[PDB]
Amino acid sequence: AGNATEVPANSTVLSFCAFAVDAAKAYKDYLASGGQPITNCVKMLCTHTGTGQAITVTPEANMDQESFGGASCCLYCRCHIDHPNPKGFCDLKGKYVQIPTTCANDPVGFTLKNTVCTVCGMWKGYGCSC
Amino acid sequence: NVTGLFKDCSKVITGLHPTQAPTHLSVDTKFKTEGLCVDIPGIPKDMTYRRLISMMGFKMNYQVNGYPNMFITREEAIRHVRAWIGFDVEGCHATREAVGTNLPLQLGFSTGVNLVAVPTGYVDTPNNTDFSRVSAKPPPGDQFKHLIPLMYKGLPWNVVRIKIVQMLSDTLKNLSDRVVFVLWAHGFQLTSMKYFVKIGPERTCCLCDRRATCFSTASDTYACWHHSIGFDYVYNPFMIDVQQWGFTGNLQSNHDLYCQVHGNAHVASCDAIMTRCLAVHECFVKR
Ligand SMILES: [Cl-]
Ligand SMILES: [Zn+2]
Ligand SMILES: [Zn+2]
Ligand SMILES: [Zn+2]
Ligand SMILES: [Zn+2]
């Protein structure tokens, strides 16, 4: 009974991060040791005529980005573990997230490793010009 | 194709909105086209769901530089025989609002200790995964109906895990610098360890030079077995699955080939005692 959410290619990485004290460091270290990035993310069919903003209520990829469902790019959502926000809110769940196409092979790692500029709404280093 | 790890055990017939779905598989079919997902303005996210997520199916087969083994070789286990603690868990089954996964009910150790936990699961919501009590039933069968009263005599997991850490610390502080959980099969034992184990790089005690065996979520500190009062998590335990050593047949039948002083009392601690007992015989009896 029940409905699978996951594929076996993700079992090891999700198990490792689901037990880690520091899940973010564990994922980063897993990748650094040659682990495969988390797959089975919610990739969006979109126009690629979007604003390029990082986190949006509709897909907003431009021609240099892919758009994904937000929860599916969040390590804490993927492992069903506690979020860093003490109120238990996710930065991504309930929104779409834009990932540079060069990094779209690992959206979870990209969002883990990078920061959105709250002033201009673009990723620092990938769009923020402040 | 798929795994049962993080299987959605809810009885909801629709899937998730693309912004809330953890995975492509879990997105509702209305949004799927051309192997991708689309956003549909006017079909918004859902703000009231509670979806039980199965923790059955962990796979601890990684190699990450700077992180130790969890499962250890027989030779390493033998070296650390003073650290052996048999561990077994009796489960109950999700029911009513969810169906299709098993929750830890009675945790037993070769110290003879049994601890009963409130049936508790990981519930996905529109926000943080909620660790919470869930409806449960005994496994089907007349031989399980004695578990029914235990489903109303359990302790909350925050208490259970403090008691596990205290039990292991009192048992092991003058025996070993670590714990080796000795298991018969490992899937549900590993599921249960999700509730009370954390892992990471090897650490040292905050109060002495010994390696850390325990972690405290309240203080984000690490302790050895001597300094762990109040700590709630077992940190970097080791473990080994005795069933994988070539046996055919079940635990009791193999245990009883060597030993006549552990009659089967049909309870988790007794399974844990027989598991460590069988392990000692198999590893050390000279043939
Ligand atoms: Cl070690
Ligand atoms: Zn999240
Ligand atoms: Zn900016
Ligand atoms: Zn210490
Ligand atoms: Zn025995």
Author numbering:
A (entry chain M): 1 to 130
B (entry chain A): 3 to 289
The authors write:
SARS-CoV-2 nonstructural protein 14 (nsp14) exoribonuclease (ExoN) plays important roles in the proofreading during viral RNA synthesis and the evasion of host immune responses. The multifunctional SARS-CoV-2 nsp14 consists of the N-terminal ExoN domain involved in proofreading and the C-terminal N7-MTase domain that functions in mRNA capping.
We obtained crystals under two different conditions, one containing ammonium tartrate and the other containing magnesium chloride (MgCl2), albeit in the same crystal form. The structures were determined by molecular replacement phasing and refined to 1.64- and 2.10-Å resolution for the tartrate and magnesium-bound crystals, respectively. In contrast, the higher-resolution tartrate-bound structure shows a unique configuration of the metal-free active site. Without the magnesium ion, Asp90 takes two distinct conformers with its carboxylate group in orthogonal orientations. A comparison between the Mg2+-bound and free structures shows a significant rearrangement for residues Gly265 to Val269 including the main chain atoms, accompanying an inward movement of His268 upon Mg2+ binding. These observations demonstrate high flexibility of the ExoN active site in the absence of divalent metal cofactors. Notably, we observed ordered tartrate ions from the crystallization condition bound to this basic patch in our crystal structure, potentially mimicking RNA backbone phosphate interactions.
